[model samples]
Target: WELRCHRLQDSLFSSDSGFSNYRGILNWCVVMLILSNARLFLENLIKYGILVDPIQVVSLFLKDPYSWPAPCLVIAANVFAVAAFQVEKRLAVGALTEQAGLLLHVANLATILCFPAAVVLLVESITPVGSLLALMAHTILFLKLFSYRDVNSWCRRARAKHTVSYPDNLTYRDLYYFLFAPTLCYELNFPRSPRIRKRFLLRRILEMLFFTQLQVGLIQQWMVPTIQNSMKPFKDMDYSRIIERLLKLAVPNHLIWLIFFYWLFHSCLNAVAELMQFGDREFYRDWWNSESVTYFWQNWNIPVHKWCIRHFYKPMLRRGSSKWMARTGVFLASAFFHEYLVSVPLRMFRLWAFTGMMAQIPLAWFVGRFFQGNYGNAAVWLSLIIGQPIAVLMYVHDYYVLNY
Candidate 1:
């Protein structure tokens, strides 16, 4: 009791280091976002002749500035998603009471798949608009379907235990909130912060501003030029010229992807999380520092990792699936979506994206076992820098050969 009293006294008298660290981290994030946005914006301006005005800068965001159909498609897909959720949620609740309700639930899901299907169909008319819509539609469909999965899983658990609480869940408002929440998992309630910092919000807004310009400037000033020059070598079809072009492309491509990791995963999503008071901030771990390809794949991009493991991997394992079999399924699914994303936009089926993803399995094994530690980490970075473009340039080369 004397020792406890002494500790309490010390606690009451001592400085709070936890709160100190919290403020320090917050301020550092604010500063980083501020500086990153500033740097990206200035680079964009410098690269793009520096004479671009407000309206001209804004115009770069639109591919078809005069078209009305693109936004209409996105709005339509969003509406359909909500409508399907309402329908499915009703069926899900009824399944608890009525024996026949499961069929209705299945049927609802079957029909709802068509919304994203329609979104994919637009690829022929407008690739960029279609890709954006397809991505949005797929995301909505994912949340809607998973909401049902969460409810059904709970209902099954309740049934096995003979619990009769029969809690009705996921109303329209909750669905809307979950739709915007920075998560892929379906949880009824989430941890929230007490308040939003005004300055934090400002930094996020600025970051979004520069991020747009940065991508545009990089594509225009760096990527396009590099790609054009690289094509000149490919046309000659000499191994010497091909190797030279491939080596030259590694820097710009790696920079685009690396910056994208920061801009999207770190800055943009975190900003949305702050605004919504969604406190689970484990968007990515130090995949760059990971010792293995499998570890990197597992840790990097936790939202997708959680979704894949929770929805795909564990379910497969429970159903008598072997570990590598489950791993292959995960990789295959990822490869297909990535390939679809690329093929749809580029209007080609080179299997570059598919091969790029599938090849990681062996690469993962090779790197993980032999090149353990910083050696492994260095190799991972090396692959991303140079290896990715090797597959990518093949597609670009083929496109030129076939079309030009």
Candidate 2:
């Protein structure tokens, strides 16, 4: 017993101890989160009663289901797609000049982009959220059609031995598959899976269903009340109350953001990929472990990252732009899209979303240059948790003023 007691050892937390395992501590944090969140739930119930109403979402999209503009707008996208396919086919067969073909594609892309903005603004029936849904669909189509044209043009230029001929690749099956392939970047030959995993598919479908409802309910129950209450403080320019409400809203907003990440990137994407037998399933990475802002953006959304690199950034580089130029250009384009998605839907031109996105470049530089290791990770996470609520408050305030 004396010999056992005499042995020297460092504390578990000490650097020299080399004690890496912290599963118990993780569990402790999770338990605390559950207990405290449950307390907030009871408080919410005491204060606001039940605010969630899933049925209201239907009205948001379809005021009159028989004459909904959003779906009709979405369905009209097929016309543009068909037009682009025909353009590419004629270009491949030497029936159209490359310059003329490029101009035609540009015209098509511009129409698809501006047409939605016109409808969403002019049409009174489209709700803000419903406009966002329709605009999102159009944006995806815009990117996919862009990639389709670029890939076909490149193939025609190169026209390698093993590559699919333009005539062969211009079929409807290939075109539709690329359009619905759960990816933004298009290719004639994508990697394929041997078979679909039924059990995995079912599990992902279940998760999608559960998480979608959870997010909707959380938004209606938790975030809506907090946002509504914060409106007065924001209007009065009361910094203290605004800060308090922002912090209050931060927890639920951040929770919903995380759940949305899982719901879309993991559950929804995987469900679609499994159905399509799509092989490239790395839609996201360990972005939670990212130690820098740049790393977080690059890792968080793989499809967008791939599209930017392939279509946007690389083209800029090829045009004799420096790496820094191309990188900043990428950020600019991203900021534009962020603004497009938020402001157009809200029927306001407040650049809160755009400015927030552009600010990431400076933040990324600061964090990368000064912080490292765990400190860097903390900086990244702190920015994420704090930054989003500020943007949320700004838009909510502006939207309230504009409409309410």
Candidate 3:
């Protein structure tokens, strides 16, 4: 497996960067992206048979906001966030009294919480995937706005006391730009890169745009087939068939997952960071190589991690809560959201998502204590690769039986 391929790089994300010789996989993924993006790079040469492809049936999601009220809800949230930030300036400058500031803080908190809840409500009639996506987007928007509040407060304190060199000319334009930037945390100043690599940005965006087609193809070509076949046994409650389906589903499910990770963490986010010159390109680290579940979770999705630390974890610690309490608090919140994302879409209050995430608490402790290094990483992978499919299969099976 560890063979040589000179043109390949070893990282899973495979950036402008890797370790082992199975660089061939990286080259293979690149080839897949090139083929998917073949029209972009190699022209319409292979458009021969692709004419039969379900062009509009699947690939039209780019135009689909994926949610009805979600688009309006997201827009409203941004409007609220920006409007509140502007109000902060007025109250801060005009001496609207400390009471107004407190009310404004409460308003900010309400907006942050309300956006996600509203998104969840809005996505009631959408596809499960689309519903889950809206929830995730809303959650991030909430934190992004909360981070804005946090940063704004720091800036105010700095300006008031002449204590820190806060940026003085902040405005709505900056706030709008920050809203689209590939970051969850807000800061007056961010770690920046010196220059933009236009070609690099182009390739990343192309990868994002075309790999989207890859996902559509996989779902239409592979996933739907497996699920349809898998559901046949659900008519009779064949447990073995369900297990078989789970194993089969694992392949595409995990492939879909890897593609998603790359598209979000590697391609699209990276492009946004480049375009806005937002600069903190460390969106995710080598979570794959983590020696423990905790490390993997922390490094995998940096924006979420930072949000959890800033809003959930630290406040508990500051209040004299135990580290265990803080950790449990974060985990519990994660579990609840995960369950909400899954449950609302299926219109079922299954705790499967909740249990799956919460199970990580024990897994984290087990791997931390018993497994180390590659063993731990392997354990984490095994569980994810195996566990997720089972969850998918179960939810799908139950959903079909309950509704169909």
Candidate 4:
């Protein structure tokens, strides 16, 4: 009745107007990406002449399969894990005093760090990849045991009521369950699934296999050559050339990261959880839609985020630290681990990763202050996409100069 002949409405493409269904635009973008990336893939094949080899990865892990140093190191990690479990048992049953238990826990954690660093540095046969995996396992063990210690300590102190059931939770079964579960946080109880779906497990398995191979192949064919070529640009200090290489490597590297995120967080974790009948499948959130860098960091890795918040962040807050101080503490702790994971593997102390992580603070503040909604989201994505290649090029350049 208001508009008998023609209605007045905002244009779909106009400012302050919105349109929801962009499926056609999405399809077009996908088609364009396929054609463009396929051309690059062809160019890569033409230049490299086929460089994909999966079996070579194993040789990186075992220089001599007969020597078995990496395997031995991994197996030996079990000793530390068992030691941690025993310390907890003694604490739970009141056989060990809190002071003694604290000392033992610190010593055990210190040794966990020392053993891997010593072996990775001294062991001549262990390659970088092998050392990386070994150190990664030990690092995970370190964090898990740290959570185990902290949670049990809290349980003991919460003994004002009979709700504190100590002896029942102090069992090998529970320890092993916590160890193998796809989480870093410790708990007396976890959610569970009544039954596992066979088809779901099969889908996850197939995805794990396919996506892993895809990632490996992409790295071999795409990233390696780009990184190698980038050394010259970095050496020459040519801005244009350096930026071009970074932009080129960004595509495949980002793609690989996206795939890796899916593979590890979704496929691998889901498969293990399904097998164990473990519930609580909230491994990740809508990180892609994150409107701020802080949001992205907090949401991207839930297990670490949970651990940091529960064990580290809240404790500092409760101790009367300022929010800014606690935030910086979290960032500093994360920077240390980031540096640890990278520097220890390469046997080089380049603060590129650490500095990169810390730099996120300023970037987060800028984006959080100036941008909102889509702009902030774009800034987040840009930081992720652009920041990684800088670190990669720097590390590869340094590694090549040092080793090669």
Candidate 3 lDDT over 1-404, as tens digits, reads 99976874455544234334576888997887676666643343245335666676446544664435554455566667666677667655676665677687777767666666655655555556655666666666666777776676667776676122445535777677777888787876666778888998988977776777778778778978777763453435567765666777787888888888989889988888888777678889888778887787889898889888886788679879889888777877777666656666666666556666666677778888998656787898887786644565567667765666
lDDT of 2 by residue, 67-139 (tens): 6877778788899999999899888887788899999999999998999989998888877877888899999
> Mind giving the per-residue lDDT tens digits that candidate 4 earns over 306-332?
989998989889989899999878777
Question: CA lDDT, every prediction?
Answer: 0.66, 0.81, 0.70, 0.79
Which residue pairs overlap in candidate 1's backbone? none
lDDT of 1 by residue, 1-404 (tens): 45543333334223442222346766897578567767667776587656758786456546555354445455565665565565556655555444344454555556555454555555355545455565555655654566555555566567666122334454667667777777887765578888998898887776666766766667679767776763453443788877777677667767767667777887888899998888788999978767777777778789888888777888789889789999778777777666554555456666456667667667877887789656888888877775555666566556655555
TM-score of each: 0.75, 0.83, 0.78, 0.82
TM-score of 1: 0.75
Better of 1 and 2 by lDDT: 2
Task: Report residue 187 deviation for candidate 4 (angstroms).
Answer: 0.8
Worst 10 residues of 4 by lDDT: 228-237
Query: After superposing candidate 4, which stretches have Cα over 4 Å from the reference?
Result: 1-66, 160-164, 228-241, 397-404
Give stretches of model 3 more than 4 Å off.
Answer: 1-25, 28-68, 97-100, 115-133, 158-170, 230-241, 388-404
Clash total of candidate 1: 0
Q: Give, for candidate 3, the lowest lDDT window spanning 10 residues.
A: 40-49
